[PDB]
Design a protein around this ligand. Structure first.
Ligand SMILES: OC[C@H]1O[C@H](O[C@H]2[C@H](O)[C@@H](O)[C@@H](O)O[C@@H]2CO)[C@H](O)[C@@H](O)[C@@H]1O
Ligand SMILES: [Mg+2]
Length: 244
C-alpha cells in the first residue's frame, strides 16, 4: 500500500559513508510512511542489530538476513520461509563436500545457520576452484546455490533462498510490484537482487564481481550510480523518480 519497497544491503551499500548515510536517513525520515524498508544483508540478525547500534541504522520494516536465509517480520522470524527453505535441503551432505576443499576454510560458527554454510577462499588459491565446488555440489541433486562475493566469501544456500528470492517473497507478501521496488547492492551476494525484475542500483564502490555481472546482464532496470555508499541510494531514488 506504499509507493516504494526499498531493499538494500548494509556494509558498503547503506553503511560506509557516515555523512551520506545520515543525509539519506534524513530525507527518508521525512516521508517514512511512503515506503517499506528492508535490509538484505549477509550478516546474521544479531550482527545486523549490532551494526544498527554502531552507525545508527534507521529501523526497517523487515530484515532479510544471512543472504535471505532468514526473514524477520516486526513480530518475529518467518517460520513459513524457514520451513520452505528446509524442503529437500541437505546441510550435512553439502557441508561434507565443501569441507573437503583445501582452499576453503569454514567461517566462524556464528556465521552459520541451518540454511547457510559459509567459508573463506584462500587468497592464494585460484578462484576457479569455486566453479569446481559449484559443479560438484549441484551434481548431488540437492537444490543448492553457491554465492561468491568480495573474492573471499562463499555461502552455500538452498536454491529457494538468496536476497533476490527473499525479495520476491516479500513483494508478494506486501502486494508490492517490481516497478515499485528498488534493490541496492555492492557485491556478488546482491546478484540475486538484480536477477529480480525490480529497479536496481549498483553503488559506485561495487565489488569487481558485481560490476562484471552488470557488464553481462545489465538491463534498463539496472542503474550504475556515480555515488558510492548511501549516496547511490539517493541518486537512484531520483533516477527512477521514486517517492515522486
Ligand atoms: O555474503 C557474504 C558474507 O556476508 C556477511 O559478511 C559481512 C561481515 O560480517 C561484515 O563484517 C563485513 O565485513 O562485510 C561482510 C560483507 O557483507 C556474512 O556475515 C558472511 O558470513 C557472508 O559470507
Ligand atoms: Mg553485498
Amino acid at each position: 500500500m506504499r509507493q516504494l519497497l526499498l531493499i538494500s544491503d548494509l556494509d558498503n551499500t547503506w553503511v560506509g559513508d557516515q555523512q551520506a548515510l545520515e543525509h539519506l536517513q534524513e530525507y527518508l525520515g521525512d516521508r517514512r510512511g511512503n515506503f517499506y524498508l528492508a535490509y538484505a544483508t549477509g550478516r546474521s540478525y544479531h550482527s545486523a542489530r549490532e551494526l544498527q547500534k554502531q552507525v545508527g541504522l534507521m529501523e526497517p520494516d523487515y530484515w532479510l538476513t544471512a543472504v535471505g536465509s532468514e526473514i524477520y517480520h516486526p513480530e518475529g522470524l518467518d517460520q513459513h520461509w524457514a520451513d520452505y527453505l528446509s524442503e529437500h535441503w541437505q546441510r550435512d551432505i553439502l557441508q561434507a563436500i565443501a569441507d573437503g576443499f583445501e582452499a576453503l576454510k569454514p567461517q566462524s560458527p556464528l556465521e552459520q545457520n541451518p540454511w547457510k554454510i559459509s567459508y573463506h577462499l584462500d587468497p592464494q588459491a585460484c578462484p576457479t576452484v569455486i566453479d569446481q565446488l559449484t559443479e560438484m555440489l549441484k551434481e548431488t541433486g540437492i537444490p543448492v546455490q553457491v554465492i561468491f562475493s568480495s573474492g573471499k566469501d562463499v555461502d552455500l544456500l538452498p536454491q529457494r533462498s538468496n536476497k533476490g528470492n527473499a525479495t520476491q517473497y516479500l513483494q508478494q507478501h506486501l502486494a508490492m510490484e517490481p516497478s515499485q521496488t528498488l534493490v541496492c547492492g555492492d557485491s556478488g551476494n546482491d546478484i540475486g537482487l538484480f536477477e529480480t525484475s525490480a529497479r536496481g542500483v549498483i553503488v559506485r564502490n561495487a565489488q569487481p564481481e558485481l560490476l562484471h555481472w552488470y557488464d553481462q546482464w545489465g538491463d534498463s532496470r539496472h542503474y550504475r550510480a556515480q555515488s558510492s555508499h548511501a549516496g547511490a541510494i539517493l541518486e537512484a531514488i531520483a533516477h527512477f523518480d521514486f517517492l515522486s
